[PDB]
Amino acid sequence: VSTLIPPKVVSSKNIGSAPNAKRIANVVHFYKSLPQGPAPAIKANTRLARYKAKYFDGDNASGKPLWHFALGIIAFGYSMEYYFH
Template sequence: MRLPCARNRSSDNPLLPSLSSPLLSSTLLIQQFESSLPKMSYIARRGLSTLIPPKIASPNAIGAAQDAARMERVVNFYARLPRGAAPEVKPTGLIGRYQARYFSGKNASAAPLAHAIGGILIIGYSMEYYFHLRHHKNHPH
C-alpha cells in the first residue's frame, strides 16, 4: 500500500512564497490548516497556532539573529568553563580522612568492623577495671 507523500507546491501556486525555511513552511502550513477549518473551536485553533512560538515563527526571526550580543555572552561564558573531570577533593577532618581511607572506592575493607570490635573491648575492659578498683577502695579482698 502506497502512502501519499507531501511535496512542496510553492512552484504550482504563484500566491505562495518559496518554502525554503522550515519555520516559514510550517507556519504557512498551520495558517492554511486554520483557514481551511473556520468552524473549529477557539481552543483547538489556539492549540494549533501555538505549535510554533510567535517569536520564532515571525519572518523577522528567520533572518539574522537580533539577539546576537546575548548569544555571544552565552557562548563566551561556556567557553571559559573548565574542561575535563573536576579535581578530586581531599577529605578534611578526622571522620572524612577515616572514611576516605577505609570506606571509599577501591580501599573499601572490613577494617572498620575490626576497629569497632577492638574499641568496644578496650572501653569495656577499662570500665570493668575502674569499677573493680572502686569496689576495692572500701572492701579489701
Template sequence: MSYITRRALSTLIPPKIASPNAIGAAKDAARMERVVNFYARLPRGPAPEPKPTGLLERYGERYFGKNPSAAPIFHVIAGLLALGYGMDYYFHLRHHKNHPH
C-alpha cells in the first residue's frame, strides 16, 4: 500500500486507545476525553435558518425567497419612471425663461 493511500485511510480509522497500564496512557486518555467532550458539546439537529441582516438581504428574502413574486419588476419600472420624471423636471427648469442660468 502506498504512503498516500495509507495516509488517506488513516483519517477514517480512529486512533487506538491505549490500555490504562500502558506507558503514556494518561496522556492519550486525556486527549481522547477532550475530543469526546468537544463532540458532546456540539449542537444537534439541523442548523437554524440564517436571518437576513442588510437591506438587500431582507429584500431578496422577501421577494426571491421561498415565495418569489413579480414585485421587483414593478419596483424597477416605478424607479425608472421616478428617475425619468425627475430628470425631465430638472432639465426643463434649466432651460426655463425665468431660470437665472
C-alpha cells in the first residue's frame, strides 16, 4: 500500500538541528565585521602618536620609552637641584 507522507514535511530537521543556534550567531557576527580596522596606534596624535607608534605599539616591548621616561624624572629633580642650589 501507498508509502506514507511524513518524509514530505521537513520542519524538524531544519529547525531541529543544533548548528541553527550557531548559524544565527555567525550570520550576525560575521557579515557585520569590518574585514580591516582603522589604525592600531594613534592615541596622543600631535607628533606623540609618533611616540606611541615607536614605543607603545604591540610591535615592540623595547625598553626605549622606559629609558626616556626615567631620564625625564632624572631631568626633573636634577634641574630642581640646580634650582634649589
